[model samples]
Target: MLGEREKLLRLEEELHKRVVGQDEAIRAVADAIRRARAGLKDPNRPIGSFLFLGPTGVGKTELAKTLAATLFDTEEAMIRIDMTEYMEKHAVSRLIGAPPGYVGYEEGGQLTEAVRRRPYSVILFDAIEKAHPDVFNILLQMLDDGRLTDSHGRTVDFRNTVIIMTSNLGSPLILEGLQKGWPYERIRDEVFKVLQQHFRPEFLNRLDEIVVFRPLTKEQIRQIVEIQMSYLRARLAEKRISLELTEAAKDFLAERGYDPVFGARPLRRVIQRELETPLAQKILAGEVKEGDRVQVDVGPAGLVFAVPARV
Candidate 1:
């Protein structure tokens, strides 16, 4: 049995195994939470509101769950709310449930219930920028005040939780500007300025910290591939297949035409191509025994890459 501190540390290590090159971002969030729980004074609130700004598939959601799983010892405790679905006023009402006697009022919301039951767990606001203005307005009170009273008389305490809001709002413009050689700081500043110009002061002020998850570079992509390959190895081991992956395999994966914008997400497809399908086919054909050592090789065909063997 791991101690409380050891459990969190172990979870951090596990996340690093899969998360790849966003070490700074991961540590920053973890440190923020640790300080908050320890009553250590951080410029950013310990149980404060956070905004994770970055492209999709780079572990923003993963990190949040990792924190919850390690900290609370249960994955089910974490609540992830996709804001894009609630982009309209009618949809926003689904959050607090309809005022008593309103239509569809009996169906309470995940956010309300999760906070009520597990206020200590992490709550994620995915694609927060895509939420309707009304939804954003609702967040102002929740983040700053640490409480959300539903349309009914029920009140949920959010003070014990770490709230993470993720956004892709500035990516396209930031990427375009960067390709034109504009500095990243300039892009970040401009994005902040544009958002501040539109959002209410209260809404922006409620966020304790805005974490801009940067686009992964080729080096970062390579790091992501290494992490992915490690997962593939473990998954293969589960099937009693000793799959040996070498450094050459790492190079082969990194050089593939996978989109870096998509980050380590494409690695799943690569794993399927190089390991899963072939392994399944071989198992079905009885070409490979359960205890056999499997060797998979990836090759390049002109500009395309192909997995040629599962031996």
Candidate 2:
């Protein structure tokens, strides 16, 4: 609490430390947060509410994870509400808990229960597209007044939290247009048309930002690979087992790990399958002793690993 003012002022800098690309998205988030904190916006509302748009694996959710880390110290402070669950009407009661005397009235609101405790938490409504209007009605109150009353007649305040909704509407269209040598401005215009048609203006007007993540590039994927590889090395570092991952191996990993649709979703799996998984077996089978060094490079079939005695 002592440094909340200072920390909120410098969010993007911290976000960039763990965040790979999507510079525009990061800046927009920072601006909204700072504005809200500076008292330039409605004081009664949450710190900020935003719509995150992008293809999968392009860091829409990644930004939320990073946002939680930047805003609060505890990892448990983040709550992810799966929008798919509330697509049906029956689930609405479960979200805010049933009314008094109704079954599960005291069971507690899944959302309100969580929001009641954590003032510094982030709540992400993942895959909010196609959500039932009942769900939207609940969201409206939270968005308009930054509070929700559970069926138990208790109001849970959201003014201290951040509400982020992630949607993939028009993403394939966005990705395909960019791939066709189209201008980004043109692509945005074409894509937001779908969003404008789908999302209610009431909802759209309430959001502080609708961050559109760009397509991941070889350059972007490499930085992500760099960050992931560094973690891998550190995990092995504790065991005194060091890795010498070549530049060629990294490039190959990026090449085989991504596609336009899949983005870098398969990267971690690729890294584990090609490098970590095989290496673990080789090390476990007494193939390499403790404190041994390993070398990794690209091969015709896949990654080639070599081992030897090294201090």
Candidate 3:
């Protein structure tokens, strides 16, 4: 079995293999987790608590999934909770289950039951800014004491878990800073000002680290295109077919899908519409079949698919 330090050192490498351009955020998270595992932090608290501030599609959620896979041996070890659904004051019970004698009490909590069953997992609270104020109070308990008492009076342990809360509170400011070429310190300070106005000091102070994810560049998008195509290649390989893409084709997809405001959100749609859709149609119509070499290239119109006739 690998030791803790060895695992910690490889954390960033494994994460980078899946997540694109968030090396700073990855290093921050890896360092915090390493400190916790090395017993330099409170033994009773979670492995680490983090606040991931960034725009959508910038690998905030993807990092959490990769962390779970790297540390826990499976991406299924991540528990995701959409905080927008818990915006109402009455909705707080859903996290810890309804109180005894109330409706849905028998179903257990969404958060408590999940951790109880899989104590060593990554808990992702998505869009933390949208959650009600009461939710923060509950979170404060977990951060400080590393435990939460359910409505059923059972205490849930968080000492073995990693807590990640993602927010878009200052994403627009960060994006603007990036566009203007502001220094990272200047951008981070600007973002912190916005965070201070929104969250209570104690709540923000309890976190081990608050990481800001940078916007993706065109080259990074091109790299991501290659990663996405690898999946398609594997699928085609199962049918005894080979998939190839020219540099022009990859560049076209990268340019078509790159968006500073939306990040890589549009990239998947572009690949599906341009590549996946056409390939599926060709397969269905018998224009391309097993053992064929399908090549994707850029044409004057757009993407051009070529399948050499079987001899």
Candidate 4:
């Protein structure tokens, strides 16, 4: 058995590598995991489950991935089932396998086998709202009892596993209001309230905690952009190339409508807009010498990158 402190440290480090910002969300998940690993032998009930409520690209899913990799050792050990896939009424069969009259009765059901066999890892249920009502009913048992009998009547024990549910449900109001110049704290409160209203109260109560991930700050966005730039630089360095991002490039990105409410997702789009043209030309024209640093200029208007000859 892992000691509580050891478990917390391992989880915290793994989360730090996987998620760039949102320290509160990171701490909330880490604390929950620490409690679960420590309380596994508690005998009262299985350790608590978590409901991660946040906007898309806020690292909710990444946190689950990190926990599974750290504790269980392999990415496959984590079962990521998108609840949104079951939005249509007939798609519920995909979760429980097939109906009697349908094809492939004994073959599939990725979720069922994963939970039954790998109960010591993590299960990420993505998006509760898109799931059919019947599917939601299916989870109540696992949430309340930490076990579920499959369609085949075999009981799958989730007692040793951690369940993480992530949703992008309450983001639009928060994001739109932020864009319209509303106070950030009030927007966050309204978002959390919307999340509570959207999810069932019983389901909410079943969770050990509902973590509301905060929107990104200008600094966080800049840090993420810097990180990506550095990653590219490092890759270039490996091939004997050097890279530098001018301060003007950084400032330009900051002021160019980088949406704080949605976090660093917009950065990727910005990257494509700013880097794609030059990067593409370099690739085609062979302007990217094997050992030259490329400078990207996103100074105020848009983006441009080029291999600079040594002055």
| Residue-level lDDT tens digits of model 3 in 1-311 | 47756778788887899999787899999999889877899988999999998788878888999999998989999999999899997777899989899988998789999999999999999998899888889999999999999989999999999999998887888878768878866766778889988998999889999999888877788899988778788988999999888988988999888776777888888999988998898899998888899888988777888987755
Off by over 4 Å in 3: 1-4, 308-311
Estimate the overall C-alpha local distance difference test score of candidate 3: 0.88
**Which predicted model would earn the best lDDT?**
3
Q: By summed lDDT, which 10 consecutive residues of candidate 4 come out lowest?
A: 39-48
> Cα deviation in Å at residue 111, candidate 1?
1.5
Worst 10-residue lDDT window, candidate 3: 181-190
Name the better of 1 and 4 by lDDT: 4
The CA lDDT at 18 in model 3 is 91
- State each candidate's clash count: 1, 0, 0, 1
TM-score, cand. 2 vs. native: 0.92
Question: Which has the higher lDDT value, candidate number 1 or candidate number 2?
Answer: 2
Query: lDDT of each model, Cα atoms only?
Result: 0.69, 0.84, 0.88, 0.70
Q: Write the per-residue lDDT of candidate 2 for residues 1-311, one digit (tens) a residue.
A: 65887688778888988888888889889999989877899988999999988788888778888888888776577899998888887777878998788878878888999988777899999988868888898998899998898898898999999899988896877767667888856755677788887887889899998888888878888888888778878888888988887888888889878887778889988888888887888888887556878888988878888886544
Give the per-residue lDDT digits (tens) of candidate 4, residues 1-311.
34646757676666677567767667777777666656643433335577776677666776787777776777777788888688776665677667665785686466778877777788888887878888888787678777776666677777778788877776667557667887735654567677677677888777777776656666766676776566656666787866566777776665553654555557666765676555666767887777777776753456667775777
TM-score of each: 0.81, 0.92, 0.94, 0.79
Off by over 4 Å in 1: 5-15, 40-46, 176-190, 226-232, 238-240, 246-248, 251-257, 300-311
Q: Which TM-score value belongs to model 1?
A: 0.81
Clashing pairs in 2: none
Model 1: per-residue Cα lDDT over 1-311, one tens digit each: 44766745554576675566666577667666666656764432328577777777777877787767766676776888999789888865688778777886787766787788787788888877778888876777687567888877787888778888887775666557667888745655667875775567777766666676666677676676666667666866787767655556665666562564775667767766765666677778776665667655554531122333454
How well does candidate 1 match the true structure, expressed as C-alpha RMSD?
4.4
